[PDB]
Amino acid sequence: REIVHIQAGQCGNQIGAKFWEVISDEHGIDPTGSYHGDSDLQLERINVYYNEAAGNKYVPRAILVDLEPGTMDSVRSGPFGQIFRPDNFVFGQSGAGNNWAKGHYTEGAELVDSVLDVVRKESESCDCLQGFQLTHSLGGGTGSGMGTLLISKIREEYPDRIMNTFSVVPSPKVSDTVVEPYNATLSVHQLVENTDETYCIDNEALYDICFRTLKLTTPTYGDLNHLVSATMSGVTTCLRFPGQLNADLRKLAVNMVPFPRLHFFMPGFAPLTSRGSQQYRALTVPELTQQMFDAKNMMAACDPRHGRYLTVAAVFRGRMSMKEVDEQMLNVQNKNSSYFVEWIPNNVKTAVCDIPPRGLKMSATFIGNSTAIQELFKRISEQFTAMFRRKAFLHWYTGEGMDEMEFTEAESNMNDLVSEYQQYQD
Amino acid sequence: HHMKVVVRVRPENTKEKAAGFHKVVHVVDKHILVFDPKQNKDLKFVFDAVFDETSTQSEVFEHTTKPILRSFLNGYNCTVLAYGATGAGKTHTMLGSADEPGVMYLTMLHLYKCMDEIKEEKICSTAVSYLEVYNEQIRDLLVNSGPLAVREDTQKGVVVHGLTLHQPKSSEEILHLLDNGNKNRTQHPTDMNATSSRSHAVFQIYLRQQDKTASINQNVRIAKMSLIDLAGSERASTSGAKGTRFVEGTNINRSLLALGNVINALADSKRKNQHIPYRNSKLTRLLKDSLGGNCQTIMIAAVSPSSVFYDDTYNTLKYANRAKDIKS
Amino acid sequence: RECISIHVGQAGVQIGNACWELYCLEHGIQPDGHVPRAVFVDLEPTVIDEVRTGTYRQLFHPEQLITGKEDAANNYARGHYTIGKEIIDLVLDRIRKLADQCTGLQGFSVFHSFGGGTGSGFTSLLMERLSVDYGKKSKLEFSIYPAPQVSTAVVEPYNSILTTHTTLEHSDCAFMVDNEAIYDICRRNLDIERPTYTNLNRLIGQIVSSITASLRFDGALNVDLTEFQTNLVPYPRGHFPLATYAPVISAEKAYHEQLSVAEITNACFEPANQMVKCDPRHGKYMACCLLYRGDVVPKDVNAAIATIKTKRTIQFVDWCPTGFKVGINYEPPTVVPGGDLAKVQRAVCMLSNTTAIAEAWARLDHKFDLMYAKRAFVHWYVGEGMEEGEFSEAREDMAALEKDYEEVGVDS
């Protein structure tokens, strides 16, 4: 089986450097070097993310899509930056203006065909394709506009292969951009109707989970991104390992989406202990489910305690009893029968790999499909209307060949998407 | 109000009569058919009306369509759904030749007189559309183009601003040529020559009523009547083709699932709220206004006495039964 | 004489590697000896690859190891229809190539895991295509039905109401082993809160050895495979007896081991020992095939059973005078060199049809309805070449299996 990652925009790119920083060590792949793998198992399944050319040069099979040179020119000029075949860099030296319309209709729309070209070179690689990983932020031009286009085209070329999306939904408290809900409401719109698995991450839900669950006082971006990239490795690549009960992107999809909207999840890692001290090793297993199922520790902004679950997928990866796993999940389902929805007798999807995250004993990725994410597309959809009412920075969109009905469309769609998610909270 | 459900059993052809297989459906009366087999469930099901084999094109048309004409005059949205397995009777009931005018031509002839009568009391104008639904794309039948961009009205309600319904009719002659183009236009798989399926498809009429004294302007009655020829589901096991036939059949079934979610939801929403997801498909979105409040609706389930129709009829009747059955 | 085996689904293959392990272990055939007599099917390569990488590697032909590199999918439809279709021909070809080579066989011991994708769906058609190509044989399917509360897959019931209805009209006798009610045996009757899947597989890997292995082996009271479905099924529904083992003692803790027949037989009817969460809550036994092995006097049995026939709190069915197939083998059991199984010099692998599964089926059927009542994960099967038909019409199927297992008992 196989996948082909996609680094849309700067954020989705910056994260690409962290996703591949990680995964490669989780696969013994040095910069241009080969498999140094401490074991022999980190190789029978690598194909999922790489290609055979030389015999030491397994190249990451991703795409780097960006209208801002300086970005991909920082990812390519730094650490692992020299592993991507140059053919992967689909740059757009144009003005990467912070407009969703500037990266979806006017400036991104040109660069697309020179992207789809390569997304096909990589899909027609070999063996069987599973799907595509997509990283980006819903708060910018090249992220939410151009990266949401890339998928609307991918989902027309292979409506069979899956589409995981890792979105950096606009964080509440402070927005790292101004038009944010514009770039966002317009991309979530495309997402609800093309990708079929989304993992929404919030730069501040991370800061919290990175400043209080890691006593880490100076959580640089490299860190947030690192934490995120730690989950997306426990999702995909992980289940492309053996296990007493393994799954794969489809099992995850076919157990986690009750209704075809696509639905968006909220990832959570297991052993999230500060370095020296907190190395408590209280990781028998009740400590991992203790972790993953708390409020805090959900990379989403919203708190699960604010809304039922439809599905859960504890994708464990570390030798453990199929009894103390399958058991714990139950008491968790009964202590919290309140929030877990009832018309699914077993919401939880236990998944169990064998090999754990390189240096750790036992971990478990959490992929929650809670109705609590209603209280985020609410947020976004609010910020929209409050400014859309006055057409705030709208001339930057229309003046790029847009429509007054296009913003209406997306808000209403993604605003209905809120409605639906409540139909199951009740 | 409620959606009306009817079933039509066709009559076995000669070839099947030679086989002389057991009859899977027995019609007791106008209201009720029995599902076989008889030496099973042996559950009797009561419909409102049964159409026999005997009914050609006069009887089928007049019964179902006539009460929708009254709701048509109201200018509330009316709709008719026609279903059928391959060889169900699909063409015969809906159409036939010019010789034996089925529902469509009798709506066209009778409702053409309806335009005459209505127009007299209030000036009326009518146009008609033939829209398709192939690979989840709307295609106008009269002109093939790219699918209409979808937008929504400000309140709500999905619209396709690819709305065309290319050419209106002054009389029967023009529409009759369009019907030739209709079958060709629908995208079908290269099926057996005997069978032909649409992708998914519909037909619409447009009512705009203005009193004679009233202008155009002033209050208008707006009705739409939609006549739907639903496609058939595919089976993976039966098909064996899969591939492009597979993808088209999955897309049909997804539109059918969304419609069925609305359908069962409609019965529940007799005690219902917004919950009914119109958004689930493009069909159900097109139908937002039409499945409708106190809209009039009818479902015509076509089936045959045929042996292959055994499975297909039983499945469709169970589902038709679910529309009458489903209560919380 | 022989009985092929078709281990389908990852789990049916993990159990398969285990039942297959216990075999050579009691036949003196180390890693590289003879040749197996079975096949392995999965739509996930990485699992059958564990039989191609791990232990028992070269004991198989790469020809009896079928894989579909494609996708497993925890959904019946896909694994039956859509995907699992492409492989079936090739699969059959082995159970027709391996079925020819032999000498007057008796059937195929199928191994599947009811609530899976490859284990539900695919086998549904595999057993399907068998009941037509060899309707003249035995079709004993050894299942691992859904844990009563500790299921895994979210959809499980969709997959297991669909494997039951499609296989029902095709099996001869369906053995059942419940994954959770085995863990109780690992907690209560062996003491370990560390039961790897590798252990439940040693345990079914044991009960199963009692079925084929030792019974197809000479003894003082041999019992062919046909003998089972004859002495075990009262009615044509592919009736599903339950597996039970007796000396499930721990090879470390307690040691009373020397537990003469009179004890090990009584230890079968206590509900806390039956690899099934179908505790005889009311379910009247209707036929039991007590397979013994080891040092057993036929009078010890024709007395240890007589005592039981008169316990009355064990209430057998009315229309059944005597429903006790005594099967005696010679060779004692053969425990793993250092797993956790005691190692006695006698055992009782009793299996039986009980009106008790009137429960287990009910509780698994009710599951299905709750989700089907909302369509839940339905769009996952419809988009895979299924219909409102195959669900609703396989629901009605098992409905007359709740009535069947009710009417054949509870009444006189």
Ligand SMILES: CC(=O)O[C@H]1C(=O)[C@@]2(C)[C@H]([C@H](OC(=O)c3ccccc3)[C@]3(O)C[C@H](OC(=O)[C@H](O)[C@@H](NC(=O)c4ccccc4)c4ccccc4)C(C)=C1C3(C)C)[C@]1(OC(C)=O)CO[C@@H]1C[C@@H]2O
């Ligand atoms: C001596 C020792 O045991 O050190 C541990 C350690 O102290 C702790 C604190 C690690 C440490 O992680 C962090 O401090 C951290 C920093 C930024 C963002 C997120 C986390 C560690 O850096 C991370 C590192 O993780 C791994 O090796 C995993 O394989 C992990 N790898 C990476 O994230 C990675 C980092 C740099 C370069 C390449 C990969 C992984 C996890 C999931 C999926 C794939 C890979 C581990 C166990 C440790 C150190 C080294 C201190 C912890 O994190 C992880 C992801 O394991 C933080 O809480 C856990 C508990 C660990 O015990």
Ligand SMILES: Nc1nc2c(ncn2[C@@H]2O[C@H](COP(=O)(O)OP(=O)(O)OP(=O)(O)O)[C@@H](O)[C@H]2O)c(=O)[nH]1
């Ligand atoms: N006893 C036992 N039960 C197992 C084993 N492996 C899995 N199971 C059970 O069987 C079911 C799991 O089926 P899966 O592994 O998900 O699927 P599969 O049947 O192999 O086929 P796919 O869904 O297509 O992967 C669960 O109910 C598990 O508890 C095993 O080794 N032993």
Ligand SMILES: Nc1nc2c(ncn2[C@@H]2O[C@H](COP(=O)(O)OP(=O)(O)O)[C@@H](O)[C@H]2O)c(=O)[nH]1
């Ligand atoms: N976690 C995370 N967020 C980022 C990174 N870079 C930008 N972001 C977020 O992305 C949003 C800005 O969009 P940006 O990535 O600049 O858009 P683009 O570059 O024009 O496609 C803000 O909400 C930032 O917090 C990053 O490296 N990691």
Ligand SMILES: [Mg+2]
């Ligand atoms: Mg499997």
Ligand SMILES: [Zn+2]
């Ligand atoms: Zn002793």
